[PDB]
Design a protein around this ligand. Structure first.
Ligand SMILES: C=C[C@H](C[C@@H]1CCNC1=O)NC(=O)[C@H](CC(C)C)NC(=O)c1cc2c(OC)cccc2[nH]1
Ligand SMILES: C=C[C@H](C[C@@H]1CCNC1=O)NC(=O)[C@H](CC(C)C)NC(=O)c1cc2c(OC)cccc2[nH]1
Lengths: 303, 305
């Protein structure tokens, strides 16, 4: 029993992290086969940061302008290209620890594990959900760029996030491994705002089922609601609309607990309208929306 | 910026996880040099667990009754012994992935990363605080025993927890790597209850230091207190008393902010005696008690390993 926010084991990714230096700038890179992937803003100076013409800055660089260190070993850069906001440095050595991997673009509401790194060395691991406004609520300091987010299915690492920026609000923004930002953000040194954030309703519901599966039922009620009437109330409170696909994805949790999805929607509606009134759910005083139905099924099936 | 519960990178420990089977009972073990450590109840059948005599169960076992596997690769057992509630199995191969390590027994309030494992295969990693009642709020399913908890210092992995049991309340209990349970529990299939839990004062203070570092300091008052007086008051609110070691490990955060530990204690006392009103601290109306002083430094300074 028990429900906890947990990240995938990070070993397979730790073996890929390297340090990439250009000029006075050092950050992290991801070393897969004979290519190192890192944020392209590593090539920018203090002055270039405001409005960098990256193609113009990159053409002026040589392979020897990039220092790549894997532990104590320096990797010789034999080629450099740019795919959107990701710099790709070809090295003369293939990473022997390269796992089975793929590059994927994650959808809002889905979760992934972040391996926060500094100077090419792992520092910590934590789960983040891609928010509807395409930010993530992570923990990143100076030099964390190039840290990656991933999921692990079987032994295949699906990389979905590379870290680039912290917004003034303290949330974080980045790209996929094709270098395309999640959200309307740009890799320039400017204060940038995200769109109005919304709450991931299907995840809140999964988290309520988790609370029930772990013995917490105080928030349930004898009422039910139609999907549309629930969505009317949800949107009033800046919650994302619930789709029939979301309802279906919640089926397994509904079958395990015997609580129809629309019955749990009526509980959430009551919570949004009455609040929690000092009560807590799984130790939280707020409604948590960073747990997917899959994250709940993975931990609570059979309990 | 950002404050998150963050596990240690788990790679060094993943490379030490193996499967240990006795009969049909399989759980996890920890392979370090040429020894595998696992819970001793792996030698118990389902019926034996109700009331086991481990010394007697073990005398009937031989090296050849133990199946240790790294994946599907068998490691031959060439010696066995019981140390408290931990079985030690000597194997004929030294783990080439063995990291620098030590075995430590942690105090209540200290945190560690749990590498949840099933059949010797790592499933997930999460942070746990040892509660004052010597349970942890983990997430564990059948077959999870032998999963370990650890901290990383520089490059040394300090193992401090091995998982053994789930209490009726849904919390979890286990041992250090010398097989000594945390708390008054035993490895027997019996309904066991943990004492009343309490809030971890030193970690709440750390969380308050974290708030100050980030500019959230409305709760600072112009009072101080003695350690004894604060301890007596705190217990009335179900808070743990502070030890000298607690004061010591708050030293760095005290120096960084310039707020003496006993001054922060007086501020916390007022929050307990007056509440927080509708105000929040670091965005929360609840005081957090599962971040140690080091956890705060980790988050705000970016330590690597
Ligand atoms: C090492 C990788 C860091 C990650 C950051 C560091 C602290 N924590 C992290 O996550 N990335 C960067 O430093 C980026 C670099 C750009 C060229 C993409 N820039 C920003 O994140 C940033 C600039 C800025 C601003 O500039 C006027 C105003 C207000 C907020 C601002 N944020
Ligand atoms: C694989 C390792 C599991 C961890 C468990 C499995 C599910 N989640 C986990 O954490 N460990 C075990 O199965 C232990 C076995 C030893 C005590 C011999 N037994 C219990 O955990 C247990 C016995 C019991 C009880 O006995 C009458 C009453 C009420 C609650 C109870 N729990």
């Amino acid at each position: 029993s028990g429900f906890r926010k947990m990240a995938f084991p990070s070993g397979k990714v730790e073996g890929c992290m390297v340090q990439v230096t250009c000029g006075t700038t050092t950050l992290n890179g991801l070393w897969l086969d004979d290519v190192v992937y890192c944020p392209r803003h590593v090539i920018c100076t203090s002055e270039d940061m405001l409005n960098p013409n990256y193609e113009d800055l990159l053409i002026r660089k040589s392979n020897h302008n990039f220092l790549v260190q894997a532990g104590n070993v320096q990797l010789r850069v034999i080629g450099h290209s740019m795919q959107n906001c990701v710099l790709k440095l070809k090295v003369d050595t293939a990473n022997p620890k390269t796992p089975k991997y793929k590059f994927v673009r994650i959808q809002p509401g889905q979760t992934f594990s972040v391996l926060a790194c500094y100077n090419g060395s792992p520092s910590g691991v934590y789960q983040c959900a891609m928010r509807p406004n395409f930010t993530i609520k992570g923990s990143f300091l100076n030099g964390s760029c190039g840290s990656v987010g991933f999921n692990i299915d079987y032994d295949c690492v699906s990389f979905c996030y590379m870290h680039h920026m912290e917004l003034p609000t303290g949330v974080h923004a980045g790209t996929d491994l094709e270098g395309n930002f999640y959200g309307p953000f740009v890799d320039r040194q400017t204060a940038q705002a995200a769109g109005t954030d919304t709450t991931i309703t299907v995840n809140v519901l999964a988290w309520l089922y988790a609370a029930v599966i772990n013995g917490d039922r105080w928030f349930l009620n004898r009422f039910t609601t139609t999907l549309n009437d629930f969505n009317l109330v949800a949107m009033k409170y800046n919650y994302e609309p619930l789709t029939q696909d979301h309802v279906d994805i919640l089926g397994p949790l509904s079958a395990q607990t015997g609580i129809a999805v629309l019955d749990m929607c009526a509980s959430l509606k009551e919570l949004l309208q009455n609040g929690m009134n000092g009560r807590t759910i799984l130790g939280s005083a707020l409604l948590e929306d960073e747990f997917t139905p899959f994250d709940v099924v993975r931990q609570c099936s059979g309990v």
